[PDB]
Amino acid sequence: PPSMSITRLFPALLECFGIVLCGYIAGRANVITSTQAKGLGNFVSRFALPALLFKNMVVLNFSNVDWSFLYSILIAKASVFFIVCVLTLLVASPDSRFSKAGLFPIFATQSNDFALGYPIVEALYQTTYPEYLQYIYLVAPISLMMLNPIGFIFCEIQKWKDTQNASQNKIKIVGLGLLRVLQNPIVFMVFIGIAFNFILDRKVPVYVENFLDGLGNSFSGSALFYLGLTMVGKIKRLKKSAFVVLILLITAKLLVLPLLCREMVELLDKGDSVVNHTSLSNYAFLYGVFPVAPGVAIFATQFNMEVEIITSGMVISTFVSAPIMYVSAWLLTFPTMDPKPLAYAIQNVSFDISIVSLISLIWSLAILLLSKKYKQLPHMLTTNLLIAQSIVCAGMMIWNFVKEKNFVGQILVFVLLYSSLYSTYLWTGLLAISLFLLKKRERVQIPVGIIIISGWGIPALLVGVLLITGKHNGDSIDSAFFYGKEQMITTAVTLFCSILIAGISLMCMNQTALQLTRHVLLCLLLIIGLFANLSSCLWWLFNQEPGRLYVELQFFCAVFNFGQGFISFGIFGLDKHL
Amino acid sequence: PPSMSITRLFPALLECFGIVLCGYIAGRANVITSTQAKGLGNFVSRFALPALLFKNMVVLNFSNVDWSFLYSILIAKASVFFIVCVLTLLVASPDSRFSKAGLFPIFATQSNDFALGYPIVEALYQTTYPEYLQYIYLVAPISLMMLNPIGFIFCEIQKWKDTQNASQNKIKIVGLGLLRVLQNPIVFMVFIGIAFNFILDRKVPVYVENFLDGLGNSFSGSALFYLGLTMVGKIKRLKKSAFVVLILLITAKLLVLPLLCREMVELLDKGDSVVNHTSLSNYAFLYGVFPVAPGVAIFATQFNMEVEIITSGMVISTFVSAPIMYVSAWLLTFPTMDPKPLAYAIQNVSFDISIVSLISLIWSLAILLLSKKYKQLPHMLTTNLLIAQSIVCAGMMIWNFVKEKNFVGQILVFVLLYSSLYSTYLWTGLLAISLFLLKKRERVQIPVGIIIISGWGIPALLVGVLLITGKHNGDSIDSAFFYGKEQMITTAVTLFCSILIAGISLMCMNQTALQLTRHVLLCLLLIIGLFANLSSCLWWLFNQEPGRLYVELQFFCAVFNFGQGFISFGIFGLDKHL
Ligand SMILES: CCCCCCCC/C=C\CCCCCCCC(=O)O[C@@H](COC(=O)CCCCCCCCCCCCCCC)COP(=O)([O-])OCC[N+](C)(C)C
Ligand SMILES: CCCCCCCC/C=C\CCCCCCCC(=O)O[C@@H](COC(=O)CCCCCCCCCCCCCCC)COP(=O)([O-])OCC[N+](C)(C)C
Ligand SMILES: CC(C)CCC[C@@H](C)[C@H]1CC[C@H]2[C@@H]3CC=C4C[C@@H](O)CC[C@]4(C)[C@H]3CC[C@]12C
Ligand SMILES: CC(C)CCC[C@@H](C)[C@H]1CC[C@H]2[C@@H]3CC=C4C[C@@H](O)CC[C@]4(C)[C@H]3CC[C@]12C
Ligand SMILES: *[C@@H]1O[C@H](CO)[C@@H](O)[C@H](O)[C@H]1NC(C)=O
Ligand SMILES: *[C@@H]1O[C@H](CO)[C@@H](O)[C@H](O)[C@H]1NC(C)=O
Asked: Which regions of this chain are Lumenal-facing, per the record's topological domains (chains A, B)?
């Protein structure tokens, strides 16, 4: 029982974010401006989406719906809404506690299901369990109807605050929130679909079937395109602790909502089939991983309260959720399997990450080279770092196709890939040390040539030492055990020395105190990658038996080792002016 | 060998024009204005259409292409282009002979294939002959490449005329036309698809397959929606003989191009299979019936020459082609079949026309009633006419479901339907006589009440006479032979008296000489309907054996009898101000 067509998930994550990338490219170039994107959004939100919802609620089978999963998923969302509203009510400022308490729990519970979740669920669940596709169209509008009025009451209280007549008349406000919920196209189109499911007896009329198919099949691509068009220039800057609350909200939505969904599904679904329960638990975890829908930013726009935070949160959560679906789904499918074909799964995941990392690295390198900022510090060491990560990805490109052909080509590919990887490891520390030296503003001529010589020679010297002294393992198909324990000891020493050098330089920068505003976080986000890289090397030497936690840590080593170009591109390449 | 899934053609004609109607409604209301429709068109023409063409040219099988059909279809288009260019060069005015000679043959040869032709061909030809769907993507870009440069040379000569330096340098102009052809997205996307068909060996890569499917499946609905958005307010008014040349161009494109396509396919396809030849001939006729693409109006816009005529021609040809596909395809499938189930085909066609006629009549009646113009002449008799045609359509609605239930209900339905039909027949003449009386501007108090009494009583008296004197035919399932020869004699006398009364009034109006500008043509277009109605009644009495020409004439009787509400709605209901 595979219960997940996980082979065909990466093409789905390529479609759903390639159309978003196309919309973003068309928005920033200047092909479709904001006003014309408003017309495309008018088409999508008023013609394609109601036809999709109406068709899929007409043909829906209410006899075969496992309701236990449905109200378990809703109990999870209700708990998330309740806790986020509770601490947003306690800790926020009195002049804006009600707007935040009405918009943040809406932000932390409303997934982007009809645009992004439906193609991903369709790819993972058409050929194995086709009945899970209807739960999107069942759960998302019920979640809207049962969670949005509570938030809208608070935002209408905040709108009441400015006027301030102490009118009372609670009907006037809570019925206003309720009718705002009912005027949403999803809600009354699901009501109409529920009525016509019983009127027409679960069958769309033949004269109307093709019209509804033509309007519903145009929702996916145009909706993803309009979502990509929505993100142009909306990230803005922020303020201290607004960064922190943005981290907390996106962390809540993408982390504690899926674990609550899994826990309440494992608590409330009491079926007699274990494999069905396991597939329901995995699908419940996958459902919460979907990003925040743009309807929350629309709601904050019509209320005209906290528009910057919610818009930044949606455009940040959509990007951030893109690797989280892949990593989470491959972590869910790692139970059972088999010991030895797990290595091919790890290799396939690293290959699929390296494709996107190489393309984004080519983009960021082209932007940095054409803008002529590569000659000025500190961007020269960054250019060296991105070149090294490109050699890492190209080494995986070679290594996937040459592991079973020749020993000499495999040895050369391993030497090049680990030289580039170790160079990236110490290049993070070299960039941090250069940032600490430039932050002191002293008259010290920084030897950038000597730094580049060290960054190109020390990993090469380590690779040569591992080639001269290490013993080749012919039965090892994974890259992490090419020379056995000698290679892992060399990677552990390089990671520990680089993290300690970068950690001292990062702590010295705060005590001594674009450019430095983003540079630090790109240095910061790699240290979490190097910390997870160091722990798996420590886990292998001290423990003889590799457990399942070692499997998860090796997978995280693959993502934070081979997707560093993605993080670098998100920080550096996606930026204007240059 | 049916060779046409003609049962499922009307849902396809409902989808392809319902999305166009949705786009038109959204454009005129004010939901999506012109500027925002430009952004939706930017998405459709730059992202969805190139992905559709690139995918369908990647997976195309060049081993199984019957090339004989392809260059027969191209020879037909070349002949149409040659003759239209020849007489446009002879008869046009010298100051604008080159612009017309370069834009009119482009107008008369460029079908709307990727938006409208592809779903209709998909419905008619997926389950029977699936290999005909690739001929759209093969023929339309080759037709573009082989016909557009000849026109573009003439339009660039007209652009040269205003500057007038007598530069010569024929390379400078014909290469400009050629590069304008190559910069069209269809042409170089078909070139790239041709290259990648041989590079990738006819298979789209798996990482790119879902992305291309997501962008290509969004072309149909959004393209039809943008086509509907394009038509808002573009019909304008016209000038004498511009009406005539518009009739000639749309007549050429929708009439003589399909007969030339059939004749050259029957002349050039010399295969050894008769049924394949017949299906190819029918598909070749169906291919030319597609309306003019909006790219011709785009081309006239970028040239900024004859924009009004070409825009009016495209928005007129798209509406006019909507019944022509249905009538033409049912005329093509009428060979062979069987004698007696031909009556069910006729009944099904009349039912499918009556659905659209009833909905459009409800719209036009609501517009005429709410605008309060029904109380003033001549619109009162028009309101009576549309009410009578609504009773005709509702009588067919009753008659389809009550022909095999009870004799009394069938008799009542036949009496009501033929009373309303005969009332429509003489109401055309009454409207013409009232127009002739109002055109005289004399002080004659027109008895509108007596006219309404005559229009409601004379058809009722004819129905009562046919009930009292006629003999019921129990073996007749068609409506035209309910009382045998007595009913057809009564319909012939009513049609001959009405055409003679309206013909005298129409000829007297021209000799004596919105409002009268459109009123006459709605009176004019019904006379062609009454003339075709009269000839089939004359054909049945004088000829004992019903031939195939009688079958075609009875079918035309059904369309011009039961779709008069469509013509009335197109003239009256689709109008502003009111
Ligand atoms: C793996 C592959 C998956 C498939 C992908 C397929 C390929 C598709 C790839 C990508 C698709 C995503 C959309 C494409 C277009 C981008 C638009 C966008 O939203 O950009 C936003 C940028 O966003 C940021 O600036 C956020 C930075 C996040 C980087 C760090 C996150 C690490 C994720 C891992 C952590 C967990 C690791 C795992 C642990 C479990 C908004 O852009 P903007 O508003 O224009 O702002 C920029 C300009 N300005 C700054 C000058 C104003
Ligand atoms: C059978 C059922 C098929 C399926 C249909 C499914 C249902 C879908 C139905 C219809 C779909 C069509 C599009 C819907 C929206 C209309 C938009 C449009 O183009 O309107 C245009 C109007 O056009 C006219 O004014 C033309 C008048 C033609 C009427 C006579 C043709 C008779 C056809 C039979 C002859 C052959 C008989 C057969 C012999 C072989 C442009 O509109 P506008 O620019 O806004 O101008 C109006 C306003 N203004 C005047 C004030 C400026
Ligand atoms: C488990 C996940 C979902 C929670 C943490 C996700 C991380 C990677 C997200 C959440 C908060 C996000 C950051 C917070 C806000 C900004 C400010 C802006 O100027 C650039 C993007 C940037 C720097 C975001 C980058 C990505 C980010 C750090
Ligand atoms: C066989 C077919 C394709 C050829 C003739 C089609 C007929 C029905 C078409 C072609 C020319 C068209 C007319 C010519 C131009 C106008 C002027 C405009 O103010 C209203 C529409 C109207 C009145 C068109 C109505 C439909 C029309 C009469
Ligand atoms: C889930 O449902 C039942 C048990 O509840 C059983 O047929 C099997 O475990 C699963 N069936 C399907 C069709 O998923
Ligand atoms: C058309 O092709 C051949 C004859 O050329 C024959 O198999 C049959 O008539 C048709 N076949 C198909 C698959 O349409």
From this structure: 68-71, 122-134, 202-210, 262-282, 335-348, 403-405, 469-487
| Angle (nearest 5°) at CA B216 between A186 and A354 | 95
- Helix, strand, or coil here: B290? coil
Q: After which residues is chain A broken (C to N over 2.5 A)?
A: 513
How buried is A403 (Cβ within 10 angstroms: 0-12 exposed, 13-18 middle, 19+ buried)? middle
A167: Cβ contacts below 8 Å, ≥ 6 apart: A160
Residue of chain A nearest B43, judged by CA positions: A32
User: With an 8 Å Cβ cutoff, is A11 touching chain B?
Assistant: yes
DSSP B23-88: HHHHHHHTSS-HHHHHHHHHHIIIIIHHHHHHHHHHS--TTS--HHHHHHHHHHHHHHHHHHHHHH
DSSP B169-197: -HHHHHHHHHHHHHTSHHHHHHHHHHHHH
Q: Please report the domains of chain B, with CATH numbers, ordered by start residue.
A: 6-329 (1.20.1530), 342-573 (1.20.1070.10)
Which tokens go with B497? Answer: 């008296």
- Which 8-state DSSP code applies to residue A477? -
Give me the phi and psi of A270, to 5 degrees please: -115, 45
For CA atoms B563, B564, B565, B571, the dihedral sign is positive
Report the alpha-carbon angle A28-A31-A33, nearest 5.
65
Enter the resolution in angstroms. Answer: 3.3
The response to whether residue A331 sits with its C-beta less than 6 Å from ligand 1 reads no
Burial level of A467, CB count in 10 A (0-12/13-18/19+)? Answer: middle
User: Which experiment gave this structure?
Assistant: cryo-EM
The alpha carbon of B228 and the centre of ligand 2 are apart by a number of angstroms equal to: 11
DSSP state letters, A215-253: HHTTHHHHHHHHHHHHTTT-S----TTHHHHHHHHHHII
Q: Tell me chain A's radius of gyration from C-alpha atoms.
A: 26
Measure B217 CA to nearest chain A CA, in Å: 6
Coil, strand, or helix at residue B543? coil
Element containing residue A551 per DSSP (H, E): helix A548-562
Q: Are B350 and B396 in contact (CB under 8 A)?
A: yes
